[PDB]
Amino acid sequence: LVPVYIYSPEYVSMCDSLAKIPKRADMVHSLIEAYALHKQMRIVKPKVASMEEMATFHTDAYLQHLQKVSQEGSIEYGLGYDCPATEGIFDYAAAIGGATITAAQCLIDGMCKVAINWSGGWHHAKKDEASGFCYLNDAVLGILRLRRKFERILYVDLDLHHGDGVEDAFSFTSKVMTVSLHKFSPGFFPGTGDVSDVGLGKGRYYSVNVPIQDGIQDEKYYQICESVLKEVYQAFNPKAVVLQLGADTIAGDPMCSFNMTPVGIGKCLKYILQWQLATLILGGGGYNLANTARCWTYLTGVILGKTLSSEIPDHEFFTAYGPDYVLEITPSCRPDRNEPHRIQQILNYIKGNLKHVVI
Ligand SMILES: CC(C)[C@@H]1NC(=O)[C@]2(C)CSC(=N2)c2csc(n2)CNC(=O)C[C@@H](/C=C/CCS)NC1=O
Ligand SMILES: [K+]
Ligand SMILES: [K+]
Ligand SMILES: [Zn+2]
Structure with a gap:
């Protein structure tokens, strides 16, 4: 009943080894540790994916290709922003992939009902192409592992x-x-996922955007x-x-783009948790490093049912965490561009799609 927390010092090191989002994995774990949340979880060392x-x-x-350049340093594999250093990508991919598979296997084995891999969630990677800071789609690997049970x-x-990489992977299955849920606007990455994108073939209506x-x-987000x-x-x-956060x-x-705080995301998380289903928790994007650690630490608290101190504890x-050194994040003073009539249209459209879904 205690959540599984996928962690080892070696894994955190490997997750930061490409320096795409420098030291973020270490910041997230260090803040979790500073709030002593890891003491309330079952710490599991991840396996490396074969x-x-x-x-x-x-x-x-x-x-x-990844393995070859790991040994020796032309097709487009999405690696053209990594020329200064490609040799570490294979081991990074095997680590992220293994960690999410390990989390899934913990769920299968009934070790826990919630398993956390905050340095996974790399949802844009394609079967044959890195994309959007994603080199291996560990979310897909986790879902595939869960489907064994x-x-x-x-x-x-x-x-x-x-989440185009994951949607594409399962587009044809029910x-x-x-x-x-995502920003969707012409020109905005990755460009896919309109409400009319509902999957294909036997998977038609089994994608929701x-x-x-x-x-x-x-x-409004929670609504x-x-x-x-x-x-x-x-x-x-x-x-x-499988929940990517x-x-x-x-x-x-x-x-x-959006103007959320971890409390709003936390309400979404709570709604999913009260289903009491095996749940695999993943990170993903997050490019304000201190805020991303604030967010995922707060959400770890949510999973544990704990209220955390507002003051950030001294740690590495x-x-x-300046200038205010607190856990809470204040929304920006920017307008909400979401008009209520269009949001209701979208919800109504999705409801119509889901009427087709029959188990
Ligand atoms: C500078 C930014 C635009 C940054 N990008 C990059 O640092 C590089 C590596 C340098 S130039 C570039 N990529 C590029 C050219 S075209 C394109 N990216 C389309 N891809 C995205 O926009 C993904 C997008 C990442 C989204 C996070 C998904 S969780 N990236 C970026 O925000
Ligand atoms: K999304
Ligand atoms: K599907
Ligand atoms: Zn993102």
Whole structure:
């Protein structure tokens, strides 16, 4: 009944080894540790993914390329921003992939009902292409592992960006339903995920996309999320949940799009947790490093049912938490561009889609 926390010092080191979002994994763990939350969790060392395990989703060519350049340093694999240093990407991918598979296996084995991998959630990676800071799609690997036991998986993606890599992976199946809430605007990455994108073939109506505009705040976001998830839960009756909680929705993120705080995301998390299903918790985006640690530490508190002290405790990264040194994040003074009539249209459209879903 205690949550599983996927962690080792070696894993945190590997997760920070590419320095794409410098030291973020260490900041997140260090803040969790400073609040002593790890003492309330079952700490599990992640396994490293085998080639075979990564190949349940990624192509041999892509994986063999990563392994080759790990040894020796031309096809487009999405690696063109990594020329100064590609040799570490294979081990990074095997670590992230293994950690999420380990979390999924803990759920399968009934070790826990909630398993956390805050340095996973890399939802944009394609079978044969890195994308959007994602080199391996560990979320897909986790869902595939859960499908060995659970007959219907719900994937919920609350990252600022559309979870295109995961949606695409399961587009043709009705056994995995993907739900993504995200900014959707012409020109905005990755460009996919309009409300009319509902999946394909046998998977038609088993993808759910909620396009949202700049400036959304906690209350309206939760109303939208609760509305959709209530309908999804009734229609699809999931047996396990994978939840991606990218913190690039949070006020202060350089993405500067949504205007959320961790309390709003936490209400979404609480709604999902009260289903009492096996739940795999993942991180993802989050580019204000201190705020991302604030967010995921607060959400770890939510999982544990604990109220955390407002004051950030002294720890390795304490200087980064200025100028106010508190856990709470204040929304930015920016307008909400979400008009109530369009949001209601979107909800109504999704309701119509979900009427088709029959288990
Ligand atoms: C500078 C920013 C634009 C940054 N990008 C980059 O640092 C690089 C590596 C340098 S230039 C570039 N990528 C680029 C050109 S076109 C394109 N990216 C489309 N991809 C995105 O916009 C993803 C997007 C990431 C989204 C997080 C998804 S959780 N990236 C970025 O915010
Ligand atoms: K999303
Ligand atoms: K699907
Ligand atoms: Zn994102």
